[PDB]
Structure formats: structure tokens, C-alpha cells
Write a protein that binds this ligand. Structure first.
Ligand code: K
Length: 282
């Protein structure tokens, strides 16, 4: 089951705006896999290998996450999802890739929504995985606004581990998402300098009342074939609004719920993730 971080081929590029760390492997049309919160590129570890047999898989850490650069922690303009979408275009440019299949998970589903519109000519087909977090202005989005939260959650591995374990588990259909080993890999990443704060900044910069999460361009319609897939979750029914609003911004799409699966499709149901992607992206 586990394929540790060191077991992949790593890279780091200086983009005009930020330094991005990514993992890459495989051959064929390019496949950009984008993570969300909590986590980093590694959440895709179970699915990279299999997908690499048919695609040139690229899995970067979003700015503010993993080994990617954590811009000025006090400058929230550098933590907007708009910047993360620009970073994807910049990455493809640096790697001389004209078009790519893109898969956005959680926060990255928003990045993808932005990207397919701002860089429509750079995407072949896209897929959105679990764009909505379970308990939503949520208690944690508010908690993440506090510096006290950064100071507490990052006070020790013990604490950091308990905190993130809650989200991994609570947001999953089954009782425990990760093995002790896998959870430890996430704690290793979380404890890296500025990673706790960098992740919380995504809430501070984008999930706020006065925060402008959507642009004029985001309101436009997309004919691009998009594949929406999310798990029934630990419960059911907060995805109702999405189901109603999607047709207002997407003309070419599909939706699917995965029974007995939570927020981390690529983690809880690897096989399903791989299957859905292989069928849609061809
Ligand atoms: K659960």
C-alpha cells in the first residue's frame, strides 16, 4: 500500500513568481494532479504509479505547502487561489507543456475552476475531486485565522499529529484513513518550517467574508469537459448547492458520488480514482 515520499523522482523549479516543488514520472499526455488541505503532493502517492503507465504524471505542492515555497507569511495576496492557478500555468510553461489533463482536489478544485477559465487553451480535459470540505465559515476556517492556532498546532509533533488526524479520519467514510506510517509522513510534512501557517493562510486569504474568492472570469461558462466526483462523505447532502449551481457555469460535465468513500478519494478508494481518471482522460 505505502510508497514513501523518497520513492519518487523529485524536482524544484523557480517560476517567475514562486519556487515550486513537484514529483514527476510516467509517459504519455501530461496529467497534473493537484492536492488541497490538509496534505501535500503525497496524498496522490497510491495513484501516481498506476497512472504513470498511461500519462506523464506531474504532482506539485501548491505554494504554501510541502516543499514548495511559502511566500511572505504576512502577505495574504500571495496566498490567493488565483496565484496557485497562475503557478500551474507557469509550471507547464517551464516544462514546455502546451496542454494537460488536470485533476483538482479540495482547494485545488477552486484553483482548477480558475485555471480552466484563465488558461482554457492549456487544458485537454479536467476532473474535480471533493471540492467541498465536510463541516462548513467552518469552526476550523475561523480557528485558522488565529495566530494562536498556528502556535498551538505546531507546538509539537504530538499535537500536530492529533490535530490533522482528526480531519483525515472525520472527513473519511471509514474510521481511519491512514496507517500509523502514512500519518507520520504527513506529520513530517506538517512540521516543516512554515507549513502549518502556510496552509492556514489559504483560509485567511480565501475563506473569509471580506475575501474575494471569485473573479469576474470565474463567473463565465466553460464548455470544457469536466468530471466531477465526490464521496458520499462521513454523512450526506452538503453537496446539494454544488449540484444546482454547476450547470450555471459548466455546459460539458458529469457528476458522481462514490458510496462508502469520504473526502480523500485518491486515498480511501485509490482504484476508483485511477479508474475514473483513465476512462475520462482518453
Ligand atoms: K470517518
Amino acid at each position: 500500500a505505502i510508497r514513501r515520499p523518497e520513492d519518487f523522482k523529485h524536482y524544484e523549479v523557480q517560476l517567475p513568481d514562486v519556487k515550486i516543488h513537484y514529483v514527476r514520472e510516467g509517459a504519455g499526455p501530461t496529467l497534473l494532479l493537484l492536492h488541497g488541505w490538509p496534505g501535500f503532493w503525497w496524498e496522490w502517492s497510491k495513484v501516481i504509479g498506476p497512472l504513470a503507465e498511461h500519462y506523464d504524471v506531474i504532482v506539485p505542492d501548491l505554494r504554501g505547502f510541502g516543499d514548495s515555497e511559502k511566500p511572505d507569511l504576512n502577505d495574504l495576496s500571495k496566498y490567493s487561489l488565483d496565484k496557485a492557478a497562475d503557478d500551474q500555468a507557469a509550471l507547464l510553461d517551464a516544462l514546455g507543456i502546451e496542454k494537460a489533463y488536470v485533476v483538482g482536489h479540495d482547494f485545488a478544485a477552486i484553483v482548477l475552476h480558475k485555471f480552466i477559465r484563465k488558461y482554457s487553451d492549456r487544458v485537454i480535459k479536467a476532473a474535480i475531486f471533493d471540492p467541498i470540505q465536510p463541516d462548513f465559515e467552518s469552526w476550523y476556517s475561523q480557528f485558522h485565522q488565529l495566530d494562536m492556532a498556528v502556535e498551538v498546532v505546531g507546538s509539537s509533533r504530538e499535537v500536530c499529529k492529533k490535530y490533522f488526524k482528526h480531519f483525515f479520519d472525520h472527513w473519511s467514510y471509514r474510521d481511519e484513513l491512514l496507517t500509523e506510517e502514512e500519518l507520520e509522513v504527513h506529520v513530517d510534512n506538517c512540521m516543516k518550517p512554515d507549513n502549518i501557517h502556510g496552509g492556514f493562510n489559504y483560509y485567511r486569504a480565501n475563506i473569509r467574508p471580506d475575501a474575494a474568492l471569485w473573479t469576474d472570469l470565474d463567473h463565465t461558462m466553460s464548455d470544457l469537459p469536466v468530471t466531477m466526483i465526490w464521496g458520499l462523505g462521513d454523512t450526506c447532502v452538503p453537496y446539494a448547492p454544488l449540484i444546482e449551481f454547476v450547470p450555471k457555469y459548466y455546459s460539458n460535465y458529469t457528476m458522481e458520488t462514490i458510496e462508502d468513500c469520504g473526502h480523500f478519494l485518491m486515498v480511501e478508494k485509490p482504484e476508483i480514482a485511477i479508474d475514473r481518471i483513465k476512462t475520462a482522460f482518453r
